[PDB]
């Protein structure tokens, strides 16, 4: 869910999720894809088309169980759709923290959204 | 849509949305309802009150018309679902401003919304 997606965000990059990520950039937080606008947002692209595989349960709102081992997000023994969902949200955490040398707060809310260029298909 | 639905916040109280209110609280943004933390949270609560009882059309996704007339927010006459949706973020984003004077910066960022009380059906 938001929440697991959320804390393991903080984890990986120390930075308040919904500060930093909420609304950024063309596909980071509120709102479908679009256009990316950095490498930052061209990771949340990735996690929006990484849930369209997922059938069987709701990335929104769906717990799932994950640990924290040698400081590593680890999946959990859940089911195969919640598996997915928890590697889907472990890869966009990931992924956010390594970049974050080109985050750019300049993105941070994008509240232009709705107009950002449509985005290709996954 | 969250489009307009930020406008008239930061119309109405001058402040960034998602920030002051992105995740405030039991019942401001992401997430769901839960027993309000202070007067600021209650105006969230009703507002999600309002969107359940909506029909027709999607209160997070569908763009409506409004113009902002003598600094005031009037809602176009659209159709019955966004006129209603509309006066749903109207009336939030006033009530919004009448609690500044009570906001807590304290519950800006409530990464524990899924622990809240169980809100009241509405
Ligand atoms: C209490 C519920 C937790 C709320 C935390 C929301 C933080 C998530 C925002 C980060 C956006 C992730 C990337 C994406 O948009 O796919
Ligand atoms: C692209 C537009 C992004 C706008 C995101 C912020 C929208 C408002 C957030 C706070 C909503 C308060 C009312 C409520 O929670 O029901």
Same mark, same amino acid.
């Given at each position: 869910s938001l929440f697991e997606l959320g804390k393991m965000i903080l984890q990986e990059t120390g930075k308040n999720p919904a500060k930093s990520? &909420? #609304?950024?950039?063309?596909?980071? &937080? #509120?709102?479908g894809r679009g256009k990316p606008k950095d490498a930052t947002d061209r990771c949340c692209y990735v996690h929006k088309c990484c849930y369209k595989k997922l059938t069987g349960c709701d990335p929104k709102k769906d717990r799932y169980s994950y640990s924290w081992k040698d400081k590593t997000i680890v999946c959990g023994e859940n089911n195969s759709c919640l598996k997915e969902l928890c590697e889907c949200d472990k890869a966009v955490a990931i992924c956010l923290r390594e970049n974050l040398d080109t985050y750019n707060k300049k993105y941070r809310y994008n509240y232009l959204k709705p107009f950002c260029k449509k985005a290709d298909p996954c």
């Amino acid at each position: 869910s938001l929440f697991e997606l959320g804390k393991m965000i903080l984890q990986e990059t120390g930075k308040n999720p919904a500060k930093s990520y &909420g #609304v950024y950039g063309c596909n980071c &937080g #509120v709102g479908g894809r679009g256009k990316p606008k950095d490498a930052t947002d061209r990771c949340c692209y990735v996690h929006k088309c990484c849930y369209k595989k997922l059938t069987g349960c709701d990335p929104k709102k769906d717990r799932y169980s994950y640990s924290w081992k040698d400081k590593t997000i680890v999946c959990g023994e859940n089911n195969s759709c919640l598996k997915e969902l928890c590697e889907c949200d472990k890869a966009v955490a990931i992924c956010l923290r390594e970049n974050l040398d080109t985050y750019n707060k300049k993105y941070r809310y994008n509240y232009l959204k709705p107009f950002c260029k449509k985005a290709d298909p996954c």
